[PDB]
From a paper:
To obtain empty P116 that is free of any bound ligands, we treated the P116 samples with the detergent Triton X-100. Mass spectrometry confirmed a massive reduction of lipids in the sample. The structure of the empty P116 sample was solved by cryoEM at 4-Å resolution. Its overall topology is almost identical to that of the original P116 sample; however, the core domain is constricted as a result of fingers 1, 2 and 3 being closer to the palm by 8, 13 and 12 Å, respectively, and finger 4 moving 11 Å sideways to retain the distal core access to the cavity. Consequently, the huge hydrophobic cavity reduces to two pockets that are large enough for lipids to pass through but that appear unoccupied in the cryoEM density. In the empty P116, the dimerization interface is shifted towards the dorsal side of the molecule by 10 Å, resulting in a contraction that changes the arc diameter of the dimer to ~10 nm and shifts the N-terminal domain towards the dimerization interface. Most prominently, the arc diameter of the empty structure is approximately 10 nm smaller than that of the original and refilled structures. In the empty P116, we observed a substantial reduction of lipids, with no specific lipid class enriched.
Here, we report a comprehensive structural and functional analysis of the previously uncharacterized protein P116 (MPN_213). Single-particle cryo-electron microscopy of P116 reveals a homodimer presenting a previously unseen fold, forming a huge hydrophobic cavity, which is fully accessible to solvent. Lipidomics analysis shows that P116 specifically extracts lipids such as phosphatidylcholine, sphingomyelin and cholesterol. Each monomer consists of two distinct domains: the core domain (residues 246–867) and the amino-terminal domain (residues 60–245), situated distal to the dimer axis.
Author numbering: 60 to 868
The structure:
């Protein structure tokens, strides 16, 4: 028969951690370090009430799987005797008896997972001598779907058959104790990891080659440059569609992705191979897409990339499902049944899917989209909000974390997404006009007195950017650059002072006209494809093989010398780009009031006027009435030598273009970048160690720590092609000419900016984390990740800094 199981239940629970030292509240230790504290946890869960039922289940599993599955067709079983000594003593001494007898009339042999080899005849009562010595239970790690620390037992002694089976195991790699962890796992931490993974001819040493290192670094530089070119082209392949349209027809950010689907595909398969088609299909899985598709063929038109992007996490499911991920790839199971079988196997796929809540957070969304069908995508798949824009922000943030020095784009996108709104611009809307409602509108929606205290976003951005660099035009920036409707729309005020829909009434458009013209210009002249063609990167040295240095448990880089003369060609910061953002300034003919307010009836010249009225003019002394004869004809000359037919637009036109506004053509030259600047990655005596992902991964990389990134921006010629003056009717022509004076001062200040704000041989030190991927997405560097000795755990906090699994002790 069989032994009686009075404690066959296996229900149990997990454990927790306690803060120590100055580690953050997020405790994520690994194995090692506490090799004797898991001893304590196992003893604690070993010498209590719920321990002996679990040991009953352990012995049940052993006597079931390890005794009579290779038996029991021709050997019966009987184990009348059973006792436990699992008290608080925590020791080990077991006392069972199991009797084996055969009912068959034949000579057979007992199959046991042990040194068992003996002839057995029919009707024989095999004796299985069960006894134990005194010992303490070691600890085995589990191969759970969680790969937790194995709060479990490695046995050391059982006196069986009259002998000892050294380092015995009762059913290894499985236990009925369910003592999983959510914080601390098993393996080699990062440095005990960087102890059996780096050596003389060991793993990382033998799987990284000098030619591969050089190819990886040079391809990283080329990818950086080229991705910059794609990003610029988009900013000019999207701006052209933003601004080329006439008002009255919307064009949002999701609609504009229709014109740059292949552009995103190129960008995303250049940042990471195999992902370009994914993002193009993703954009096609939107409301504004030309074709409407579901998320099933989207999620399965690559498989590996999506599973390894979403499920990354630390583990415990990626490499675990890698026993079924390859099985999941099998049969590609065949067409017209592949969909059905994948929907069927989602039932066991879903745990890895639901183990989310890191940066990639749309895994719950995809699991709801995959459990049941989805049809309309025209809001039903838009309420997920883990949508094109959010995922774009996520992956671009990842790119920034890998490429720190393009911080401007990710930053500006962050305050773009800093609001809970603007989600409709990720769908059917009009992009530039709505963002003007967001960037260039003082929201005052009411009619009592005034709700103008909602300063627009672009005003705040420029007041933070150009805050107090110059003190003269700050009041100008407030008065006519910001208190304007051009940089502060003041909605509902247009329909509060007129309320008849006149041409100049609708102030959302008059700002929009100039902003859209600037977008059109950037989309056809400056950042067009034709003009962005002539921004070329070329090799300089790129020939010396970067051989590795090895010294025991270390791996070093001898020397690096790579230079990249980024030829700027003649990038045409064209006359006309500035013309639009000059249209940002008012064109009203009331110039005289503006100059009277800024220069005379202001905050500082008024003080000097009062001072000179009171006293002054040294040398004269007694002449007090002359002062109201001095600041009465100087102002007369200044305000009589201004042509009223010109507007402040034309004043800044003289200041910037040189000649006046309407006589200056867009097909001129205004700024034409010359020469070429150089990037100088290099480093000598640099360490190299196994590079892990932002969190754990099965796929080891290799990062070269200590690269000295020298950016020499010199050897450029930023010419201001209108460097002289040829004017005929200056706005302030006369004996007080500012237009020529302003042109001189602007040329001087712009030369100062281009000489100082630009090249200074900026130096920067960082680390290159390159995960060299093979042709068919089969990255060369890898571990066995099978034995409980190479499961590296980067999320560990090393015990060298000090870790104790006790509450502040």
């Amino acid at each position: 028969q069989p032994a009686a199981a009075t404690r066959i239940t296996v229900e149990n629970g997990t454990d927790k951690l306690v803060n120590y030292k100055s580690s953050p509240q997020q405790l994520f230790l690994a194995k090692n370090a506490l090799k004797d504290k898991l001893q304590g946890e196992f003893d604690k869960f070993l010498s209590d009430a719920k321990a002996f039922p679990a040991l009953t289940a352990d012995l049940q599993e052993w006597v079931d799987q390890q005794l009579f599955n290779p038996n029991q067709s021709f050997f019966d079983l009987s184990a009348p005797r059973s006792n436990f000594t699992l008290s608080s003593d925590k020791k080990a001494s077991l006392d069972f008896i199991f009797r084996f007898t055969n009912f068959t009339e034949s000579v057979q042999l007992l199959k046991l997972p042990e040194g068992v080899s003996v002839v057995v005849d029919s009707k024989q009562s095999f004796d299985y001598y069960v006894n134990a010595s005194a010992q303490k239970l070691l600890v085995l790690p589990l191969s759970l779907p969680d790969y937790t620390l194995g709060l479990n037992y490695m046995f050391d002694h059982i006196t069986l058959n009259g002998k000892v089976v050294n380092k015995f195991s009762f059913n290894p790699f499985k236990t009925n104790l369910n003592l999983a962890f959510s914080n601390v796992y098993n393996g080699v931490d990062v440095f005990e990891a960087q102890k059996n993974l780096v050596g003389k001819g060991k793993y990382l040493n033998t799987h990284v080659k000098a030619e591969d290192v050089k190819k990886d670094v040079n391809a990283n530089i080329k990818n950086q440059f080229d991705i910059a070119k794609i990003i610029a082209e988009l900013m000019g392949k999207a701006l052209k569609e933003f601004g080329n349209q006439q008002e009255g027809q919307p064009l949002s950010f999701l609609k504009v992705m229709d014109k740059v689907k292949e552009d995103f595909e190129k960008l995303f398969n250049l940042v990471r191979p195999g992902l370009g088609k994914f993002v193009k299909d993703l954009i096609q899985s939107s409301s504004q897409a030309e074709n409407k598709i579901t998320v099933y063929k989207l999620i399965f038109d690559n498989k590996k990339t999506i599973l390894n992007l979403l499920k990354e996490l630390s583990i415990p499911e990626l490499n675990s499902s890698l026993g079924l991920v390859d099985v999941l790839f099998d049969g590609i199971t065949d067409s017209d049944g592949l969909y059905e079988r994948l929907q069927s196997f989602k039932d066991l796929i879903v745990p890895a899917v639901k183990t989310n809540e890191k940066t990639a957070a749309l895994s719950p969304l995809i699991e709801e989209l995959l459990t049941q069908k989805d049809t309309y995508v025209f809001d039903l798949i838009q309420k997920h909000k883990g949508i094109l824009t959010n995922l774009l922000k996520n992956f671009l943030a990842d790119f920034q974390k890998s490429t720190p020095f393009m911080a401007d784009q990710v930053a500006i996108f962050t305050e773009l997404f800093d609001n809970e709104g603007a989600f409709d611009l990720f769908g059917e809307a009009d992009f530039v006009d709505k963002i003007a409602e967001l960037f260039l509108t003082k929201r005052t929606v009411k009619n009592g007195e005034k709700i103008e205290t909602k300063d627009s976003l672009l005003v705040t951005s420029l007041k933070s950017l150009l805050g107090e660099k110059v003190a003269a035009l700050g009041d100008l920036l407030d008065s006519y650059i910001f208190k304007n409707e051009l940089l502060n729309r003041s909605v509902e005020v247009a329909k509060a002072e007129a309320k008849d829909t006149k041409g100049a009434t609708d102030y959302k458009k008059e700002q929009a006209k100039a902003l859209k013209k600037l977008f059109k210009h950037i989309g056809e002249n400056t950042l067009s494809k034709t003009n962005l063609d002539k921004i070329t990167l070329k090799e300089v040295k790129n020939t010396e093989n970067v051989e590795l240095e090895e010294t025991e448990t270390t791996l070093k880089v001898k020397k690096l010398d790579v230079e990249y003369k980024v030829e700027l060609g003649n990038f045409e910061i064209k006359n006309g780009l500035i013309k639009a953002m000059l249209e940002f300034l008012p064109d009203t003919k009331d110039l005289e009031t503006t100059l009277d307010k800024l220069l005379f009836k202001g905050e500082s010249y008024k003080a000097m006027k009062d001072k000179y009225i009171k006293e002054g003019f040294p040398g004269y002394g007694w002449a007090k009435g002359v002062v109201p004869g001095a600041f009465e004809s100087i102002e007369n000359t200044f305000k009589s030598a201004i042509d009223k037919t010109k507007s402040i637009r034309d004043l800044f036109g003289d200041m910037l273009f040189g000649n006046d506004l309407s006589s200056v053509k867009e097909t001129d030259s205004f700024i034409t970048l010359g020469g070429s600047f150089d990037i100088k990655y290099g480093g000598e005596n640099l360490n190299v160690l196994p590079a892990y992902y932002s969190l754990i991964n099965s796929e080891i990389g290799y990062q070269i720590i200590g690269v000295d990134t020298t950016i020499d921006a010199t050897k450029v010629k930023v010419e201001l092609k209108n460097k002289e003056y040829k004017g005929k009717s200056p706005a302030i022509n006369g004996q007080v000419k500012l237009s020529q004076s302003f042109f001189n001062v602007w040329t001087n200040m712009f030369d100062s900016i281009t000489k100082q704000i630009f090249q200074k041989k900026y130096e920067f030190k960082d680390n290159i984390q390159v995960f060299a991927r093979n042709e068919d997405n089969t990255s060369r560097l890898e571990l066995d990740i099978s034995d409980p000795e190479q499961r590296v755990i980067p999320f560990a906090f090393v015990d060298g800094f000090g870790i104790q699994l006790k509450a502040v002790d």
